[PDB]
């Protein structure tokens, strides 16, 4: 702000406090920082404790540090010598604190290295010369000679450990400049002083102050999270130190460079370095785009270097050759999620039983990274191959005897996402829909998806398939066949019999969508009466309580359904044949209706609570019998006098925007003339 | 020792439901074979209805003695509290499933549009890269570059160590 440099020009007690508070509120600009350090260094009337308090509490940059600020600072870090006596000596504690503040925030590398020979600066120059050395060509034997000469020099304190840290960084960086580990051996072998040097503190209170100031500073220029990440990685680089006419692709540093020398660009065969992963532009600044640049410079074919690299590093992951099979798997996924030829090659060479046996976790990850984006090149033969692959993985999962193994279901969810991507395009939609029907056939087999050994993975895959069917049925512009929206009766009645409320909601959603599509179709076809059978069976099982009077329920005649009720003892025989065949009698929706009833009691602040833990006609009648005079006046849900009205009031609460059970309420409100007015 | 009791009754109920399911399957196929002579080659459309009648018998029994225990709240038997614990952990996670599924489906749509954009970009850049033309003493040059490096480093050393008050990036 203008208050800061106004105080600065005034200084050319109250001004100090104003400068402190305006720095704590705004922070100085780079010319303001230049003027402040120029005023602070040149004069000596200001107290030294106030000088270090300023450099530790007042210098707060707002944006980029310009080169002129560094050049002005470097002018003040010098010492009086035999060729310069007119300038006064800057206090060494002020120089050390300024270098520490620099830690807090090819020529310049030599500038900082020649300042490293100062004894009092060595405790803070070392992170700067570590962070300056980012490339192998930066180091040189003259730098090594100077570092060793000053390290083994007597009269110093921090030189051995810190210079050993510098040499360790150089050894970790270049792998050249003939061996210098024996030079490290010549320097101290205590592993204690450089152990304390390798972790450095930056006064995290001041870091938080600068964090809040910089967050108050420019939008989309230094956000807080990236600043914290950059500071953390700069500290971790210190921490983990224990262990010409044509232009190469490495030396390209900016997007401007690629333009004028694209026909003069030489792509190197250094695939491992450029595929395996900073304010300075260097070779690693543009490492993201290298994989695409190779496939642009060399025309796409199944012989290019990134394709071979992905294939080899995936075979290494499958063969348990790599120590960490989670550092290159995201790289392979990011490269091969696009670029259809590589993904199709990976699918052809890896999606089978043989590589499933080797490692199913990495196969599951590559199926999550490749399958949802794949679009086939040859339509014929894809369906048979995918049926073979899904059958192989299903036998592999089911021979184990453990129903917890969810790899088949997870890969099924992935291939339903592939079917989503396929049916988003109007072409090859029949292949995707037939593959969806095959997946529905595999998901509903009673080896993983049972009524005793549950598997919510299979239910998630099934409701994903039903969601994709509902989203497919809303597309009028695509002239798909009518037979590809039914899944047969044998799946629908089975999943109606299943006790999963989300799955029943998805089934009701599928019925609602397919009827709204089938309304324009003729009223008497092979599948219209099939949908009519579906909705009449589901409505009879859900609301009507007329199962025994029907011809059949889910393909089963009600005589067997009654004979199961025979020899099935119930403690009270008031209403046995209609007690538990309703919305409150469904195994997945029994206690849900009780939760909804309790929430309705809580919302209306009713003094009466439904003490019985089951909603049926007998319990409803007994509940009105025990508290008749209280029910008659006030203290319960309004507008309800019978069990049917209670079910309607429950259905109102299930239609609210708070539950994942919208579709059952809409199904009952749609195909019931009594409930058609509640839509 | 109560946790041991709950663990024990857990594998007992797992083996119980397993043996009852396979017992029902064996009983129904035994009825099929005893009514026939050797008819065991029944189609998928019949095995599925066998699975359907198994499933409805299972959940009908579950609801049947769900009627027996939850009709009158005794609030003293520990099996009762086991039922409320099981129910309250069953119905808790229902919304988050559909929320995560919808969010990841929107993510998949983002993948689809990003892939389409990158396919277009690669197509355009392959078309452009085929239109560019093909790609096409130094003894004193390396010596004068070495001389430049030595002179500039000596200049840096003389500017720093002599206390000269204007350090600048001199090319």
């Amino acid at each position: 702000s203008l208050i800061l440099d106004d105080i600065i020009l005034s200084l050319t007690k109250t001004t100090l406090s104003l400068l402190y508070e305006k720095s704590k509120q705004y922070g100085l600009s780079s010319p303001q920082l230049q003027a402040l350090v120029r005023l602070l260094c040149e004069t000596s009337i200001i107290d030294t404790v106030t000088k270090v308090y300023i450099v530790e509490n007042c210098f707060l940059p707002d944006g980029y540090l310009t080169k002129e600020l560094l050049l002005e600072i470097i002018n003040h870090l010098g010492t009086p010598t035999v060729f310069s006596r007119y300038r006064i000596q800057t206090p060494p504690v002020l120089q050390s604190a300024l270098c520490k503040w620099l830690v807090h925030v090819n020529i310049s590398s030599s500038i900082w290295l020649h300042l490293w020979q100062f004894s009092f600066l060595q405790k803070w120059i070392t992170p700067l010369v570590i962070w300056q050395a980012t490339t192998p060509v930066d180091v040189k034997p003259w730098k090594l000679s100077i570092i060793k000469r000053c390290a083994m020099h007597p009269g110093y304190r921090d030189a051995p450990g810190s210079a050993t840290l510098i040499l360790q960084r150089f050894q970790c960086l270049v792998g050249a400049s003939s061996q210098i580990t024996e030079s490290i051996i010549t320097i101290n072998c205590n592993r204690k002083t450089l152990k304390s040097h390798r972790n450095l503190k930056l006064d995290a209170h001041f870091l938080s102050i600068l964090k809040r100031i910089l967050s108050r500073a420019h939008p989309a220029n230094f956000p807080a999270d990236t600043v914290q990440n950059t500071i953390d990685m700069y500290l971790s680089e210190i921490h983990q130190l224990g262990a010409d006419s044509t232009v190469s692709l490495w030396d390209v540093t900016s997007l401007e460079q690629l333009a004028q020398n694209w026909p003069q660009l030489h792509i190197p065969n250094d695939v491992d370095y450029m595929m395996k992963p900073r304010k300075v532009m260097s070779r690693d600044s543009l490492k993201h785009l290298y994989s695409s640049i190779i496939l642009i410079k060399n025309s796409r074919d199944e012989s290019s270097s990134p394709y071979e690299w992905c294939i080899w590093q995936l075979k290494r992951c499958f063969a348990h050759q790599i120590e960490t099979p989670q550092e290159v798997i995201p790289i392979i996924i990011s490269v091969s999620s696009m670029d259809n030829k590589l993904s199709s090659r990976i699918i052809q060479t890896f999606c089978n039983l043989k590589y499933l046996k080797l490692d199913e976790l990495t196969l599951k990850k590559v199926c999550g990274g490749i399958l949802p984006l794949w679009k086939p090149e040859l339509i014929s033969g894809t369906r048979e191959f995918f049926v073979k692959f899904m059958a192989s993985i299903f036998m592999w999962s089911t021979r184990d005897g453990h129903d917890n193994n969810c790899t088949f279901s997870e890969t099924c969810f992935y291939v339903l996402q592939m079917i989503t991507n396929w049916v988003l395009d109007d072409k090859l939609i029949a292949l995707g829909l037939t593959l969806l029907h095959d997946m529905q056939s595999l998901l509903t087999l009673d080896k993983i998806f049972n009524n005793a050994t549950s598997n919510r993975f299979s239910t998630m895959a099934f409701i994903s398939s039903l969601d994709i069917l509902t989203q497919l049925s809303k597309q009028t512009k695509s002239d798909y066949a009518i037979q590809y929206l039914i899944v047969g009766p044998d799946i629908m009645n089975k999943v109606f019999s299943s006790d999963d409320p989300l799955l029943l909601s998805a089934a009701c959603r599928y019925l609602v969508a397919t009827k709204n599509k089938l309304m324009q179709y003729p009223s008497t076809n092979k599948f219209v009466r099939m949908q009519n059978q579906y909705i009449m069976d589901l409505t009879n099982y859900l609301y009507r309580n007329k199962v025994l009077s029907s011809k059949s329920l889910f393909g089963v005649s009600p005589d067997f359904f009654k004979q199961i009720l025979e020899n099935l003892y119930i403690p009270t025989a008031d209403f046995k044949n209609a007690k538990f065949f309703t919305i409150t009698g469904i195994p997945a929706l029994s206690y849900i209706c009780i939760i909804i009833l309790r929430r309705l009691e809580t919302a209306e602040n009713t003094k009466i609570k439904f003490t019985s833990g089951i909603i049926n006609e007998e319990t409803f009648n007994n509940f009105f019998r025990v508290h008749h005079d209280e029910i008659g006046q006030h203290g319960w849900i309004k507008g309800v006098n019978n069990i049917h009205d209670l079910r309607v009031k429950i259905l109102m609460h299930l239609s609210n925007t708070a539950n994942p059970y919208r579709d059952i309420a809409a199904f009952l409100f749609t195909y019931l003339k009594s409930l058609s007015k509640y839509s | 020792s109560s946790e041991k009791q709950w663990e024990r009754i857990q594998q007992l109920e797992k083996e119980h439901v397993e043996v009852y399911r396979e017992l029902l399957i064996t009983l129904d196929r035994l009825y099929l074979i005893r009514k026939h002579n050797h008819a065991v080659i029944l189609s998928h459309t019949q095995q599925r209805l066998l699975e359907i009648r198994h499933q409805l018998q299972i959940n009908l029994e579950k609801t049947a003695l769900l009627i027996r225990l939850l009709e009158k709240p005794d609030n003293t038997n520990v099996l009762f509290t086991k039922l409320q614990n099981l129910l309250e952990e069953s119905n808790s996670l229902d919304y988050e499933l559909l929320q995560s599924l919808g969010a990841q489906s929107s993510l998949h749509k983002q993948l689809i549009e990003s892939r389409a954009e990158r396919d277009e970009l690669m197509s355009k850049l392959i078309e452009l890269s085929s239109k560019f033309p093909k790609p096409t003493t130094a003894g004193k040059q390396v010596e004068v570059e070495k001389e430049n490096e030595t002179i500039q480093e000596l200049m840096i050393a003389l500017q720093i160590h002599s206390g000269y008050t204007n350090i600048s990036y001199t090319i």
Partner: peptide
């Protein structure tokens, strides 16, 4: 198609 559907029916029988 028919061979694939019969193969799925074989899976269902084998399940």
């Amino acid at each position: 198609n028919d061979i694939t559907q019969d193969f799925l029916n074989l899976i269902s029988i084998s399940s």
